[PDB]
Amino acid sequence: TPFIRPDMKAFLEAIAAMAGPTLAEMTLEEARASYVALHGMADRPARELAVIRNLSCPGPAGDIPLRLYDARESREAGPVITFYHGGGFVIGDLDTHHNLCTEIAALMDLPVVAVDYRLAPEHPFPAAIEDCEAATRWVASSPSELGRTASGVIPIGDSAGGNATIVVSQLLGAKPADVPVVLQVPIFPLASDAVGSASLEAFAEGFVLTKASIEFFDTAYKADRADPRGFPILGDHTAAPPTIVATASLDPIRDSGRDYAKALVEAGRDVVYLEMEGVTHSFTNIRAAVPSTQGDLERIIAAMKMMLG
Amino acid sequence: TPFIRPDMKAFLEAIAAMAGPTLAEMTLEEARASYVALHGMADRPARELAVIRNLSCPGPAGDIPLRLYDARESREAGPVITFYHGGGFVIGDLDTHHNLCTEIAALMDLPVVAVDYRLAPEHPFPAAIEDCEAATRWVASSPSELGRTASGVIPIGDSAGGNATIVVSQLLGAKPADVPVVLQVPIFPLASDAVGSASLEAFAEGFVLTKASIEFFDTAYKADRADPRGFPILGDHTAAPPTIVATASLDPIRDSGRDYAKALVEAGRDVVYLEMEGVTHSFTNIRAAVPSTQGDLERIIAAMKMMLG
Amino acid sequence: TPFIRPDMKAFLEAIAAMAGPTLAEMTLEEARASYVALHGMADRPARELAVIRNLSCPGPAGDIPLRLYDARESREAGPVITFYHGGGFVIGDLDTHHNLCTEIAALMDLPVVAVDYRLAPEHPFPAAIEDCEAATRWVASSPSELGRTASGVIPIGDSAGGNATIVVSQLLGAKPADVPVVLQVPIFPLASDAVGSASLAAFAEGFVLTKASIEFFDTAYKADRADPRGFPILGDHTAAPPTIVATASLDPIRDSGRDYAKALVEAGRDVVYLEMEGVTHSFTNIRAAVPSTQGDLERIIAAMKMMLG
Amino acid sequence: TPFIRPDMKAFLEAIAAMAGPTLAEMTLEEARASYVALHGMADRPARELAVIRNLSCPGPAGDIPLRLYDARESREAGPVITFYHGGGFVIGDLDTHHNLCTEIAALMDLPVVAVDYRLAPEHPFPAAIEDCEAATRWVASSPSELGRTASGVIPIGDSAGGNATIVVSQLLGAKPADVPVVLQVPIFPLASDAVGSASLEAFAEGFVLTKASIEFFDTAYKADRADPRGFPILGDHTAAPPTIVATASLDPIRDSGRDYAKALVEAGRDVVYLEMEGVTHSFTNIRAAVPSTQGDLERIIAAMKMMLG
Ligand SMILES: CCCCCC(=O)Oc1ccc([N+](=O)[O-])cc1
Ligand SMILES: CCCCCC(=O)Oc1ccc([N+](=O)[O-])cc1
Ligand SMILES: CCCCCC(=O)Oc1ccc([N+](=O)[O-])cc1
Ligand SMILES: CCCCCC(=O)Oc1ccc([N+](=O)[O-])cc1
Ligand SMILES: O=[N+]([O-])c1ccc(O)cc1
Ligand SMILES: O=[N+]([O-])c1ccc(O)cc1
Ligand SMILES: O=[N+]([O-])c1ccc(O)cc1
Ligand SMILES: CCCCCC(=O)O
Ligand SMILES: CCCCCC(=O)O
Ligand SMILES: CCCCCC(=O)O
Ligand SMILES: CCCCCC(=O)O
Ligand SMILES: CCCCCC(=O)O
Ligand code: NA
């Protein structure tokens, strides 16, 4: 049997005992609220920060809501973290990942701008990507309303947001923003199609993210399987920015993250590959329920500081 | 027209002006002396250290000479770096890599033990591996002659020595020493056979390490292509220790390092892959002639500190 | 302090920073290799020539290897330059001075024959002299193997080779070859014993050639202090051929070359004395690292053309 | 005993057969006239030149007559030769050395300005020197009357004029004129006191210049034996300009020129020493009676061109 940490296993066993409905058995609204409730109980509380401020920027389909997190009211020029939440491009919002954003801002002492991008099925592919790209370009322009100067941007995100991280880095690589992507941090990302992977079959059930849920998100989002904005393993890696790929050993889409890190090495790009042992998908947002996952987040933070120099 | 840093280019132009005999055209003693002279003129001078001491330990063929480097006269238990010099398993000694060892000791603030392993053609494969393994096990046993206690070992080395790094970590993985390998650092290693690789053809001449020298070393050492002690890409990667793989973009054996880091990701192991841009093989020992390579070494140092947490 | 050109000073600072061992502290083959690397890395690249050909002639110990350089594939009878490399009669070979030889051949438009004479300590005094004399007489005989008829010979050489230049001219003056010495060009020669000289004390350290190296060479070669083949200031100067003596103002053996040119004037012989200002011993072979030394060599070339008519 | 060329010997025999009187036996006017007659008969005819023009300049005791020689009516800026005739500071004028001056101007393609300096015993030491210095400074100032621009000056002169050459170079070295002395050419100069020298006794009679005449000149000129303006061997040689010293092997004051060239080498100064074999003092002005002395002058010319670049 696969190795599972004791605190992780207890979390999984409690979820199994609840025996709740699948995403397909719920309404959209019920599914989104269930995710809000999961992270609300499972994650550590928000860090206190000097700045937690709602902003917005123009997008291709209207204003894109943003949330700015900063431990400092006033700071020197530096990189700005641009964050895209997970949820399959169907669920999640600025609140489901709020506490994680405050933690990243507190531990990095950098500003974090989270993106409230358009969700499927109401707005299918490529809506989320268009919004994530637009918001990152806007931050990269050091607009007056941001209140600090960006010398570069750091795309970061979990699951679907790790997909968006890579896609944004590819889009900005092809058509630069006002400053470069200095580092990207895809966290358990979907880079290659998970269908047919060994990890998908091994961890299809019982490891937080299920095969059933992956299928539900895919049907809602309707990403074109040949489009690198849907599956960025298909993109041009030859100028990828410095990268930290974090995966989880029990993740059904673990092998997609392995595939991406291998593609970067094959292209000669600098990459840190961290595969967290004995924890699942979503470990960044269950840090109270599974206290050892705070340590996993902290390893990602230490790698980011090293790769920023 | 691959990218070459200006200071790197100037060094290559001087080597081209020199236009010496090949290694195979020299006597063995001349070939070894020419490597002493190259690193002697090209590398930064030694750091001053509290401790630089010659030791030996028992090996399968007789005593193995060693050299201990430590910035501290007295130090508590901690990891000990075990270093294996490059030179194709044919050339190099404790002096060719002395200055680099003093730099590693100074910048890491950890003890370094360099291994004066037996060389081919006089001692063919697996002599060098036997000696590197034996010395590493000896250091790992916290002998009184060392004057330090090891809580773990950190194998590190450049080119052959990077080959030896991986092989030693595999041998100690299979049959543990008294403490574990807590980190390995293969620097432009030979892991897979370079014959047939795209990098070997692209950088066969004019990039410090030549295809001719690679063939000279191979003929002397006589490693079996099917033996994982000769080509450690063939070994079992499923329990590889935390790894930093450092390569050079102009290295004929660059793709061998790429292959190894890809195999570690494929096996789910934690790895930092750094491919230094615009510099050749041997960048760790040309830090005066090509001043920008000091910064490349400092990037490896920073990755080591991060991976040691 | 003494005048030092800025590019010369930078080279001396680089040598000082390297802080290498003395020749005596190296193995003999490491000492030889350090000199290969010094010239190899500091000198300008070889000129392209129509003819660069290895050959040999008989000598008293066996065959003497030679290298012919000629900008012309075929040429009529004319003077032939016979070149003897520096290195204390201990180090140096055809390759350490190869590029300089191609430059002399190109700029003079005369053939150059360089002599691979036997070295100390393996072959002590007068081995080097026997071989240089024998090769020069052989060239002077217009052998068919050379393919260039000699109407005269031009002995030339740097440091120990400048010693050989003068000794050869004295030996051929006393027992003529088939054609005369029409010009000799001792470049920073050892003519009188440098022990006790003001220049030896003034430039004992930090000026390329060191007092320690002079002593190392003297111990290996074992020249008799009373033998004019060892110290040709002791020889008969009354029929010395037309001479160009070139010295360096920062050379510990500068005063030896001053002594020789003064003895030629005392004897009524025609001599051009050129003391290059602000450069060291070996200036003929560091023409890339210290670009201004190319002009010093060109001044010697101009004096040679004038003295040949 | 000493080597004498056949053409030189016959001229000496003809002088002996004519059996003229000594300078002491003649009247001053007769002595001066015999010198005009000697060079008029013995030297090659004047070259035809575009410019042979009398000039004058201010001096410390009145105006100094000059004669300008130039193959060109109009020329670019360049060095100007400043010539001082021989004659012991007692005899000689602008006409005694006129043909030589036309030859120097024709063969160098440079302007020559000859100085008609004050003569002893009417004007004893240091009169001649004061005028030679003033005229050279005037030329060096590129005065309108000169008709061409001087970028440097070249002092040149035979016997007493070679004395003046060296003294002028020393005085301008200590107190620069408007342009530097770029080259000096003392021709059989009096630099050190000839009294006591081996050459003076060996060639005291029968070699055109006699010990009797040397003494005659000395008594008239009354140079101070301790004054470097009388005997410039006593001056500071450490900044002497590039120098060509020409002597004659049968000259009673040959050793004086040897001494000066040796002093320049001792001081580390660049110098061409040419000792013309088998000819006497005055060889520059007997080029028809002794035809081979034209070739001697032409060697000086060739050295001058080389030393000017
Ligand atoms: C019901 C809670 C599990 C789903 C939430 C989650 O685990 O965040 C994901 C985001 C994107 C993808 N995906 O793109 O497949 C999968 C998972
Ligand atoms: C004189 C050129 C540098 C060659 C020595 C060197 O650069 O260290 C190496 C060690 C091993 C291998 N190899 O295994 O191919 C290549 C290089
Ligand atoms: C490494 C610098 C010393 C290399 C040798 C060299 O500089 O060429 C010489 C040849 C002969 C003598 N000598 O006769 O003493 C000195 C020098
Ligand atoms: C027939 C007269 C002698 C010819 C030589 C001559 O008159 O040229 C000299 C100039 C100066 C000195 N001196 O300074 O001794 C000697 C000789
Ligand atoms: O979801 N759950 O049943 C939970 C909720 C809270 C908790 O502390 C542990 C488990
Ligand atoms: O164990 N816990 O605390 C939990 C458990 C389940 C959950 O959905 C969130 C937190
Ligand atoms: O005065 N002259 O022309 C001469 C003098 C001597 C001589 O042998 C020939 C010619
Ligand atoms: C061009 C080779 C692509 C990657 C091969 C691998 O995944 O091991
Ligand atoms: C194949 C040699 C050129 C380098 C192209 C690459 O980075 O893979
Ligand atoms: C370039 C100077 C001409 C002199 C050529 C010679 O006679 O050797
Ligand atoms: C030529 C006779 C002149 C004598 C000049 C003098 O007494 O100095
Ligand atoms: C450095 C020397 C320049 C001038 C040479 C001389 O004194 O004759
Ligand atoms: Na050789």
Residue numbers in the entry:
A (entry chain B), B (entry chain A), C (entry chain C), D (entry chain D): 4 to 312
Give the original sentences from the paper that presented this experimental model.
To advance the understanding of esterases, we have identified and characterized E53, an alkalophilic esterase from a marine bacterium Erythrobacter longus. Family IV esterases, to which E53 belongs, are widely distributed in microorganisms, plants, and animals, specifically degrade short-chain esters. The family IV esterase can be characterized by the α/β-fold hydrolase group, and contains two distinct structural domains: an N-terminal CAP domain and a C-terminal catalytic domain. The catalytic reaction relies on the S-H-D/E catalytic triad located in the catalytic domain.
